[PDB]
């Protein structure tokens, strides 16, 4: 499998894929020739005939902090299956470099330490409550937003391109930009013609034209 | 895998992503044993845990009369790409057996002939208009509802099961029931555990428990 | 809430109901900053800002219900818009009335025909008359409606209720209120745009200026 | 119409389009078409699974809920949401503190009153850390990651009667977490008030949960 590490403990892993660039060509024509088929992909992208790209589907396995997953799960045109907090416990601790370009009254390394401290105290409280007989669904409410979760994400190339427009962009939070770069990399590997046509004609973000 | 329907129709499997284990994987979130896995499929189906079945996706190539495709395209939770009537000619002629169980004042063979006569006259009216310089988008409005169309259908196992509940049923028009039987057969071949578990616990129709 | 626009020879687009207006999108957007409605100038500015920068989810809180009478070839195209709700007349249970879209000779203006446009109109009426007569003969003889209706041409009128939010409605206008779309659906999309303009003037104006991809509405 | 939920939460009806008769109109168009016949049609639609007419009834809710509740709720894709952003808003001291009664029926080695206190303590410590980071110049989007899952959020929810009934089947049920059950009871109450025939028919023929057939 194709697996990209994200943040300190996260990842994006390709689980499955149905189709490639020719799946959109076949769907558009309702039925190869490299030059005519690439020309069609570009024609579809430039004129907004996006429905043929829905016949390309991906399944990802993603490990991400809850604050990142909350943003991600806002994308309704997809399928999700997530780990339940009701039925390990790792946390995203930003490195001092996350604060590069910000003027802080305390050194960036003390911000990292303060974050570790509060997650350690939160986690210890959670374990103490669980050991005391408190149900998991109640005890987990003390856990911070940087707690890592895992989910399977099934999405088609059209909804994936919408996700890249919105998340592979400087206005999106830096943490989800990182995940969106890994999504774009896997997408580019499986659908190079669709990805190149997307960048040239439909892509509304900024970071994929620079990175 | 291709199944012939009606006089000139078909259902053909173009592609598939996943199998029964894709739903097992999604329910667990991980990327066990055959008996435990088959038991989990049944457990998910009996308790209405349907989201894991969304990670199994199919692409079909369907050739169907427009009156059948109009009913089929009412299923919004799926992807379609159809032949265009403006730019992109065979018709569904029911056999006398289609009227078995109905008391008609004219012989069922005369009904078949009357239907052929209409398609012949409308088709020739269409060709006359086209030859006279009338644009295709205008001339085609005279064509009857039994005109065959072709489409690509990308659907997940969850929306496919909803389609079987509604169309592989005696309340659905007989013509779409024929198409739904072919969809059920391809589904059964690719996902035998999901299909078997669906029939036992979730299936609301009647014809799949008889045919 | 009520509006009705006549389309083609026998069709229409009628506004049945509407939930919200421009301020519904303002309220939905402001939750982001823990705020709500402010003043008319600031609120109108926010609508334009949302539209220009692609902040489309607030426009989903504005919903419309339409009652449409359209030929089946138009409705087939329309029903491809999945992010909406539909309830249509059934050819299986209803006895179909003599209503078909007959294009007027003016529909072929700009086209060189070997027969007069008036004869195209007449040829269309003749084939629909024969198809309709065959349909009535079959249902009178005991053929089930669901079988007898298959002989009916694509210009047969249908009726449907359409519940759609302002975001999906704007997608519909981008695709159908455009010169590449068939002239008949363009007519329906103009009526949809006109009702939308009346109920959501700020959203409509911002759509035309920043997001609208078609040509005919400009 | 505003219903208070938990210690600081709520469900408020913002807007509604349609009523029971909206579903009656949508259904009768099939056949090119009084109170007793209309109520009978609603029951017929519900019992035979004719659900699309109920999509023409739409609601807008304004909900204040803890993030762990909002996370489960937002899993309902057939709806529209607009939420408070943790990136642009300065967060207020609004956290869900369960009362000792939340642990009734559970054998704990510490008193339930100590569980409530332990939750408040860690909430107080995490909130103080958040404020210290924010005051130090740490961007909000980074600083808020230390905040616990019981932090309250606010959102607008636009949903039709069909997706709302799916939500009640799954959340107004004893298998759903107690906290979201509370929210689903308030949703059911507002739905019952606006669509009494649809609600009554739903309970009698389509409702798969348990708590709405026991709780008034
Ligand atoms: C930089 C940034 C900041 C913020 C946010 C996002 C970004 C990038 N978002 C999330 C978006 O609103 C949206 O949910 C997401 O981008 C998915 O964005 P989205 O585009 O709505 O994705 P989708 O997958 O749900 O749907 C895919 C497509 O399907 C259509 N669609 C689907 N369901 C529909 C329906 N019901 N009605 C109409 N059309 C519908 C529509 O065309 C849509 O593009 C916020 N949301 C919010 O509530 N408050 C906020 O402050 C913010 N903001 C801070 O986080
Ligand atoms: C025997 C029979 C007779 C008739 C018809 C059908 C049959 C079987 N149908 C079609 C159905 O109404 C429905 O469109 C279709 O079955 C898809 O049926 P459907 O069940 O609506 O399927 P979907 O794929 O569109 O969506 C899949 C699931 O997703 C959810 N969903 C999707 N979009 C939603 C949304 N916007 N709001 C809420 N939930 C929504 C919902 O849970 C749904 O089950 C008719 N429709 C109509 O208008 N008049 C009629 O006389 C008839 N009737 C004559 O043909
Ligand atoms: C120039 C040109 C030419 C053609 C076509 C389009 C254009 C622009 N089409 C496409 C077809 O007309 C399409 O079904 C309608 O435009 C419906 O449009 P949406 O998908 O935009 O609306 P819809 O209402 O279905 O969805 C609205 C929005 O939600 C999103 N969406 C909904 N469902 C989705 C899903 N499953 N996956 C990903 N995203 C989803 C999309 O972002 C979409 O814009 C076509 N069709 C055809 O069959 N044959 C043809 O020959 C042509 N030709
Ligand atoms: C008690 C309990 C326990 C859990 C969960 C729920 C509940 C009630 N869930 C969440 C569950 O998987 C699901 O996300 C929602 O609760 C149910 O949302 P629906 O998909 O039914 O509604 P939603 O509003 O998303 O959709 C409504 C209807 O539309 C259809 N639909 C929508 N989008 C679709 C698509 N892309 N494909 C096919 N059909 C679609 C379906 O018919 C569905 O019923 C969960 N989840 C989890 O990940 N792990 C877990 O451990 C649990 N545990």
The residue of chain A with its CA nearest to that of C171 is: A48
Contact C66, C37 (CB under 8 A): no
Distance of CA A146 to the CA centre of its chain: 15
Contact B69, B149 (CB under 8 A): yes
Domain extents in chain A? 1-211
Question: Which site among C71, C96, C152, C154 would you substitute to test the B interface, given the most B Cβ atoms closer than 10 Å to its Cβ?
Answer: C154
The 10 Å Cβ neighbour count of residue C176 is: 24
List, comma-separated, the residues after which chain B is broken, a break being a C to N distance over 2.5 A; otherwise answer none. 31, 88
Active site residues of D: 171
Nearest to C154 by CA among C191, C100, C203: C100
Nearest to D116 by CA among A129, A87, A145: A129
Report the b/e string of C102-115 with b at 16+ CB within 10 A: bbeeebbeeeeeeb
Residues with Cβ < 8 Å from A110, sequence gap 6 or more? none
Residue D187 and residue D43: Cα distance in Å, rounded? 21
Distance of CA D118 to the CA centre of its chain: 27
The 10 Å Cβ neighbour count of residue D120 is: 14
Helix (H, G, I), strand (E, B) or coil at B44: helix
Distance of CA C150 to the CA centre of its chain: 24
The 10 Å Cβ neighbour count of residue C136 is: 13
Residue D28 tokens, joined: 């009768």
Distance of CA D51 to the CA centre of its chain: 21
Contact B121, C127 (CB under 8 A): yes
The angle that helices A34-46 and A21-29 make with each other, rounded to 10 degrees, is 80
**Element holding D20 (H helix, E strand):** helix D20-28
End-to-end CA, chain D: 17
Binding site membership of C92 for ligand 2 (Cβ less than 6 Å)? yes
The 10 Å Cβ neighbour count of residue D99 is: 13
Residue C54 tokens, joined: 């692609």
- The shortest CB-CB distance from A129 to any of D118, D126, D136 is to D118
Residue C125 tokens, joined: 């009426």
Identify how the structure was determined: X-ray
Residue B57 and residue C57: Cα distance in Å, rounded? 28
Residue B48 and residue B16: Cα distance in Å, rounded? 23
Edge-to-edge strands, sheet with A10-18: A3-6, A10-18, A57-65, A148-156, A79-82
Half-sphere exposure of C181 (CA within 13 A, CB side): 23
Residue B78 and residue C33: Cα distance in Å, rounded? 36
CA geometry: angle A109, A114, A120, nearest 5 deg: 125
Question: Which site among B69, B71, B134 would you substitute to test the C interface, given the most C Cβ atoms closer than 10 Å to its Cβ?
Answer: B134
| Distance set, CA C127 to CA B126, C96, D175 (Å) | 10, 17, 61
Contact C202, C47 (CB under 8 A): yes
Contact A1, A14 (CB under 8 A): yes
Q: Which atom of ligand 1 is nearest to the CA of D79?
A: 36
Residue A173 and residue A167: Cα distance in Å, rounded? 8
| Distance set, CA A76 to CA A79, A156, A173, D78 (Å) | 8, 12, 19, 8
Residues with Cβ < 8 Å from D162, sequence gap 6 or more? D51, D52, D54, D55
Binding site membership of D56 for ligand 2 (Cβ less than 6 Å)? no
| Distance set, CA B58 to CA A18, A26, A57, B155 (Å) | 9, 15, 10, 5
For residue D5, list its beta bridge partners.
Answer: D9
Specified resolution (Å): 2.0
Half-sphere exposure of D87 (CA within 13 A, CB side): 12
Please give the backbone phi and psi of residue A153, each rounded to the nearest 5 degrees, phi first: -125, 110
Distance of CA B183 to the CA centre of its chain: 6
For residue C65, list its beta bridge partners.
Answer: C17, C163
Residue B76 tokens, joined: 């919004």
Interface of D with C in 16-75 (CB under 8 A): 16-18, 22, 25-27, 29-32, 52-53, 55-56, 58, 60
For residue B172, list its beta bridge partners.
Answer: none
Residue B6 tokens, joined: 């009606």
Residue B46 tokens, joined: 């009996």
Using a 10 angstrom Cβ sphere, with 0-12 exposed, 13-18 middle and 19 or more buried, the burial of residue D103 is buried
Contact A92, A60 (CB under 8 A): no
Length of chain B: 211
For residue D154, list its beta bridge partners.
Answer: D64
The 10 Å Cβ neighbour count of residue A36 is: 9
Residue A44 tokens, joined: 């579809």
Contact C161, C14 (CB under 8 A): no
Residue D146 and residue D127: Cα distance in Å, rounded? 8
Greatest Cα pair distance, chain A, in angstroms, is 67
Residues with Cβ < 8 Å from C194, sequence gap 6 or more? C3, C5
Binding site membership of A156 for ligand 1 (Cβ less than 6 Å)? no
């Amino acid at each position: 499998h194709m697996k990209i590490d994200i943040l300190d403990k996260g990842f994006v892993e390709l689980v499955d894929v149905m189709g490639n660039d020719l799946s959109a060509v076949r769907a558009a024509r309702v039925s190869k020739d490299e030059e005519r088929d690439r020309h069609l992909i570009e024609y579809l992208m430039k004129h907004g005939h996006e429905t043929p790209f829905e016949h390309i589907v991906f399944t990802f396995h993603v490990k991400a902090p809850i604050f990142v997953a909350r943003q991600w799960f806002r994308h309704r045109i997809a399928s999700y299956n997530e780990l339940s907090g009701r039925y390990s416990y790792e946390f995203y601790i930003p490195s001092p470099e996350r604060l590069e370009g910000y003027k802080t009254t305390i050194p960036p390394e003390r911000v990292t330490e303060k974050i570790s401290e509060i997650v350690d105290k939160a986690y210890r409280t959670y374990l103490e409550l669980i050991e005391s007989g408190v149900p998991r669904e109640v005890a987990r409410i003390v856990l911070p937003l940087n707690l890592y979760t895992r989910f399977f994400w099934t999405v088609n190339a059209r909804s994936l391109m919408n996700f890249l427009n919105l998340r592979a962009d400087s206005h999106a939070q830096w943490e989800i930009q990182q995940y969106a770069l890994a999504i774009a990399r896997i997408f580019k590997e499986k659908c190079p013609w669709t990805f190149e046509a997307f960048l040239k004609y439909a892509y509304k973000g900024d970071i994929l034209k620079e990175v």
